[PDB]
Design a protein around this ligand. Structure first.
Ligand SMILES: *[C@@H]1O[C@H](CO)[C@@H](O)[C@H](O)[C@H]1NC(C)=O
Ligand SMILES: *[C@@H]1O[C@H](CO)[C@@H](O)[C@H](O)[C@H]1NC(C)=O
Lengths: 41, 41, 290
């Protein structure tokens, strides 16, 4: 399953956040490594 | 160098933060990968 | 002139004690044939030693003399028994001037330790005056024979005598039992890393990360600093590579490592087939550093 990567989503701080998605890699297939996303908190 | 590994520290939200450092998905040898530590916020 | 005194042809002056006694051969003129070199003829038709006079002196240069046939080899054998050391046991340099027309071979051969002659270089065709230097790997009995063939094809009669090989300049370095045509400066061998200097009067050390050349003894001019990303060896004979190259970049410093690359590897080229059935493949033994 895609979400089997370790999620390091930057918890809301300093008026900035990062939706960082990085592989832990024994997995195969699944949706490719999703990149970090920016949005105000 | 030391600043080469990608920083993925979690901040203080809901009283929990995580500091884990890992290298980029694309360094040879050098200092080992630093482990995570837990601290109250 | 006895060893320890150098002459240019008009007068012989004694070598100063400050300079090491260096004996070397130089034959710019040939009014008298040197005792070291002897001439012989190898008949091309029968491949037998004719015993004739292969080369004739002319006072200034020695050329090839016509024998029974122009195909016969015009040998001129020069033999040195050993090499006197002051890689540089013998740096022999030639001045070959060939006015020959066609099928012109100068089989300059070298016999290492009185082995069977192996042709180091084989000039072909008409060539002008040039300097050729040959290197002797180790001290031994070495003979330089300059076999000449006016014509490869065989034709009756000596119709080709214009093909002559002029060798008017011979220099042999570090010879045993020879005349001292020029004395190099020096009187003990300085330790590795120290450049021999006669004006200073004492063994002087080269600056760090520099390699010294023994070909030019006097001064630090022969002592050359090493290249980028290298270290000087304790012998100063050749620069050493630390296998770790560190270079600067705006972001940070890059330190490429080649420690595991010191060991040799056996990587060969693809099997290559000759023009005929026989096949080969180049194999290169690489030792990067260490
Ligand atoms: C032959 O060439 C060498 C070059 O290193 C030189 O030192 C030497 O003096 C030459 N021989 C003679 C007889 O001058
Ligand atoms: C070079 O070898 C010969 C024997 O072939 C020997 O007589 C001579 O002394 C040697 N030269 C040295 C050791 O400098």
């Amino acid at each position: 399953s895609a979400s089997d990567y370790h999620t390091f989503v930057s918890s809301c701080v300093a008026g900035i956040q990062k939706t960082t998605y990085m592989w832990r890699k024994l997995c195969s297939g699944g949706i490719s490594l999703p990149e970090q996303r920016v949005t105000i908190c | 160098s030391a600043s080469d590994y990608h920083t993925f520290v979690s901040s203080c939200v809901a009283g929990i933060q995580k500091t884990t450092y890992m290298w980029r998905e694309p360094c040879s040898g050098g200092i080992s990968l630093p482990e995570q530590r837990v601290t109250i916020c | 002139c006895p060893y320890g005194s150098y002459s240019n042809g008009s007068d012989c002056t004694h070598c100063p004690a400050g300079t090491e006694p260096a004996v070397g051969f130089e034959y710019k003129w040939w009014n008298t044939l040197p005792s070291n070199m002897e001439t012989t003829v190898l008949s091309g038709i029968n491949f037998e030693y004719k015993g004739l006079t292969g080369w004739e002196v002319a006072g200034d240069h020695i050329y090839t003399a016509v024998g029974a046939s122009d195909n016969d080899f015009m040998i001129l054998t020069l033999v040195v028994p050993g090499f006197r050391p002051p890689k540089e046991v013998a740096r022999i340099t030639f001045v070959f001037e060939t006015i020959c027309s066609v099928n012109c071979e100068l089989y300059f051969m070298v016999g290492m330790n009185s082995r069977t002659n192996t042709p180091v270089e084989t000039w072909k065709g008409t060539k002008g005056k040039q300097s050729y230097t040959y290197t002797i790997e180790e001290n031994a009995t070495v003979s330089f024979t300059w076999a000449f063939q006016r014509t490869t094809l065989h034709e009756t009669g000596r119709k080709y005598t214009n093909d002559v090989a002029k060798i008017y300049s011979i220099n042999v370095t570090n010879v045993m039992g020879g005349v001292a045509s020029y004395c190099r400066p020096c009187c003990t061998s300085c330790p590795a890393g120290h450049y021999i200097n006669r004006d200073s009067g004492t063994c002087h050390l080269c600056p760090s990360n520099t390699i010294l050349k023994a070909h030019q003894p006097y001064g630090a001019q022969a002592c050359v600093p090493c290249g980028p990303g290298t270290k000087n060896n304790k012998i100063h004979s050749l620069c050493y590579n630390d296998c770790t190259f560190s270079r600067n970049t705006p972001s940070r410093i890059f330190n490429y490592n080649f420690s595991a690359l010191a060991g040799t590897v056996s990587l060969a080229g693809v099997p290559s087939f000759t023009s005929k059935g026989l096949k080969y493949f180049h194999h290169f033994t690489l030792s990067l550093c260490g």
